[PDB]
Design a binder for this molecule. Structure first.
Ligand SMILES: CC(C)CCC[C@@H](C)[C@H]1CC[C@H]2[C@@H]3CC=C4C[C@@H](O)CC[C@]4(C)[C@H]3CC[C@]12C
Ligand SMILES: CC(C)CCC[C@@H](C)[C@H]1CC[C@H]2[C@@H]3CC=C4C[C@@H](O)CC[C@]4(C)[C@H]3CC[C@]12C
Ligand code: NA
Ligand code: NA
Ligand code: NA
Ligand code: NA
Lengths: 459, 448
């Protein structure tokens, strides 16, 4: 029907009243309705986040930091990159340098959006490169033509998903993990921009280079590209300063200094370079007056404000389940769960989140699964990073059917790509992604964070 | 000049280095920069708020019911503005009191005074002004009616911007400053603000109507503007009945945030009659995200960071032992000389900037001289809104200035009397009816 999720919303609040007895059932009812509206997306993912703060007081259950500074500093750069169309110039420049094209054009279209989705969002990059890739494939073919379109679509979407890793500020499921982690463990200083990039870039490079070979074997065995570049025009003043500030912020992030009062952090670099976008004149004379590179309404458009509401709603639901009396019941109900090998819990939880993320949303899976796996990690006396590092990477591995993330729903709205093509292509990419994450969590991420010893910022 | 406030930004960070000595004159440098950029508006009022988060660590100086009520009122106001119910309310309040020259100024005043309790002053002043221009043009001594109508719209949108904590940003800043710093106070909410602020604003509105009517000037032309926006549709009858339900539930787990979230979250759920194979709600999330004030929290966080930074850097001790005879004054004289200062500075500055600068000045002074904090902080937040002179203070009277009429001396002569009667009514109120409502003559228990 049409009015589906008004009657699905109002017709699950009616049978679910197990509420007509003790308090832990009243908290189970809140947990059920919030999880059901998060999984099915009947409400827009932050109206649901405000529902525990409405429903827990009526039953009787009662209750800025550096990551926000870094998020402000990266959104300031991303708004200027997307606004002045620098992101189209540095996508058509990676193509035409790699594009020898027996099969290197697929690698160029993968590497462009993989680099671009480290900074922008996956949805915006997948919506930007797909017209360019469609025009390039059309004007190369008009000079086997059906498999190139679906290969190009899948190589855009999957590599925009893969490039969405390697940065904490690259996807929303990374922002949610970082905001959960620095709130639950505020005595921990080992997770920042560079330490995330250092362990996540060797994984994503291997996943990209293996997915290229997999898709190129699965589907298949000059002036046409140097004409969409000249339709961009010449280079403007507003995107040379954005490029210079990009290069300066990038090589100031990864290069950490010597002095030590309090300001050698990443949020200092983020604010100190990203607040120059409001100040530097664009040479866009308002007419007596000038205009900057970035105004405040555009920043407010680009800034994710609902992520903090989502983290606060998840934390409120977790404390409601703690102080209501429910977590004791399911904690004494699941006592043989802590007699497992610690790597088997990694395996079953990673397969669980990467199976659930194919039909659910990427923030909705990780917001439900982080307060399940954190006290389990503290209880069985393993490192709480050892459990939570592979689960946030396996939640991003949404490569099957186009209901999981909007990156492969954008490339699906075009005429090509049957659903069985997406399923058969994304199954091998999911397999190699889980295999590379399992290799990494036992080979190179172990000495980087000392995962085999219980930490000191944990209870 | 054109690039004047880039070289005002970069050439005040250069002479201000008194920083080349002790720690106390390093927090008296980030104070001057932030205060100057707030008073001048060289940076957009929240880029400046993030500056103590950048400048205080580099010197060596290291450190929710109102949010839910704000979410509820913002998602009500989004649906009121989106489906054009405010035009129906404004054109219905006029034409009841609408056949005389005066009683038509009062209708245009009462419409935007009622409408700016819920919407913003800028949005109501930019909506009633074309309607009022069309009515004054098609009804028509012809030149003085235009400037009288412009000034009555711009003043009554400001006067109506009181009576609600969620009615103007300088009220939101005070409420967010006061639910912090005194978290054991449970006497300040929506209805207790309305109960003390409505009798003041009604008297100010009526006396301003009489003042402007004496100062300036001693049927089928309004109805065709009401029949121009058609009959009433489903999406605004639903918004009207939810407005009436929320309004008569506010004035009677039973909190104001419960009323704001139980009725306010129904706007995202209720099906509007715009079928997308699908349907669309009354409001979506992008519209709410555009309407929601996100920079007010950044502003109050930057104010709290700058206020706490003056504590460990021993500057507050210096300017506290420097101003020791300040605490030998009568307590009402502090009200008088602070309310006159906040109503004089706000004519040339911004309304959030003045109150963000002056709340951490007046709130420790109240605890120092052993009076009630609300006694000092209520007339200062009421008098900061009294921006009725020249059109650089608030955008409500800069909207009505962009039209052809209304030179500056008219605004000055008209706003001087409105400022005088506003200060007089607030001084009468804080000594007559706000005293037993909050027990202002005794030192509280939420105060140290
Ligand atoms: C979804 C959130 C908000 C609420 C529910 C949290 C549940 C799933 C969590 C919170 C407390 C957890 C328990 C905490 C401690 C132990 C003891 C350990 O030897 C085995 C696992 C076990 C038994 C955990 C199982 C999972 C658990 C019950
Ligand atoms: C963020 C900036 C603006 C904060 C500035 C705070 C200043 C204005 C405050 C903080 C400490 C205050 C002092 C604290 C105590 C006393 C003693 C009293 O007998 C007279 C007032 C006096 C002397 C106050 C004057 C105002 C004061 C100096
Ligand atoms: Na991205
Ligand atoms: Na998904
Ligand atoms: Na208002
Ligand atoms: Na002002």
């Amino acid at each position: 029907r049409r009015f589906l999720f008004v009657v699905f919303t109002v017709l699950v609040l009616l049978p679910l009243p197990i509420v007509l007895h003790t308090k832990e059932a009243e908290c189970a009812y809140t947990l059920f309705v919030v999880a059901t509206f998060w999984l099915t997306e009947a409400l827009p993912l932050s109206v649901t986040a405000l529902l525990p703060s409405l429903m827990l007081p009526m039953f009787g259950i009662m209750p800025f930091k550096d990551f926000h500074l870094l998020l402000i500093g990266v959104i300031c750069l991303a708004t200027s990159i997307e606004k002045w169309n620098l992101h189209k110039r540095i996508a058509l420049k990676m193509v035409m340098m790699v594009g020898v094209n027996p099969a290197w054009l697929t690698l160029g279209f993968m590497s462009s959006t993989a680099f671009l989705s480290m900074w922008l969002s996956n949805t915006s990059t997948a919506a930007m490169v797909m017209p360019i890739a469609e025009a390039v494939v059309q004007q190369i073919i008009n000079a086997k033509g059906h498999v190139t379109r679906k290969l190009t679509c899948l190589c855009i979407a999957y590599s925009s998903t893969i490039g969405g890793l390697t940065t904490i500020t690259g996807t929303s499921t990374n922002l949610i993990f970082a905001e959960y982690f620095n709130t639950r463990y505020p005595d921990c200083r080992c997770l920042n921009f560079g330490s995330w990039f250092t362990f996540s870039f060797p994984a994503a490079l291997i996943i990209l280079l293996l997915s290229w070979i997999w898709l190129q074997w699965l589907f298949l065995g000059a002036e046409v590209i140097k004409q969409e570049y000249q339709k961009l025009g010449p280079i403007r003043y507003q995107e040379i300063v954005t490029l210079v500030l990009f290069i300066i912020m990038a090589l100031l992030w990864f290069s950490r200094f010597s002095e030590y009062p309090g300001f050698a952090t990443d949020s200092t670099v983020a604010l100190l370079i990203g607040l120059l976008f409001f100040l530097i004149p664009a040479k866009t004379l308002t007419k007596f007056d000038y205009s900057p590179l970035i105004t405040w309404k555009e920043f407010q458009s680009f800034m994710p404000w609902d992520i903090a509401i989502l983290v606060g709603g998840g934390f409120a639901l977790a404390d409601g389940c703690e102080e209501s009396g429910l977590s004791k019941w399911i904690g004494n109900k699941l006592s043989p769960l802590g007699s497992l090998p610690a790597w088997l819990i990694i395996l079953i939880s990673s397969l669980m989140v990467t199976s659930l993320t194919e039909v659910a949303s990427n923030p909705a899976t990780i917001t439900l699964f982080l307060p399940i796996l954190s006290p389990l990690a503290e209880a069985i006396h393993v490192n709480p990073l050892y459990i939570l590092i592979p689960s946030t990477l396996c939640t991003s591995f949404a490569f099957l059917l186009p209901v999981a993330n909007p990156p492969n729903a954008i490339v699906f709205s075009y005429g090509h790509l049957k659903v069985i093509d997406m399923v058969k292509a994304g199954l091998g990419v999911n397999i190699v992604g889980v295999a590379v994450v399992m290799l990494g969590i036992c080979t190179w991420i172990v000495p980087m964070f000392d995962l085999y010893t219980y930490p000191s910022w944990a209870p």
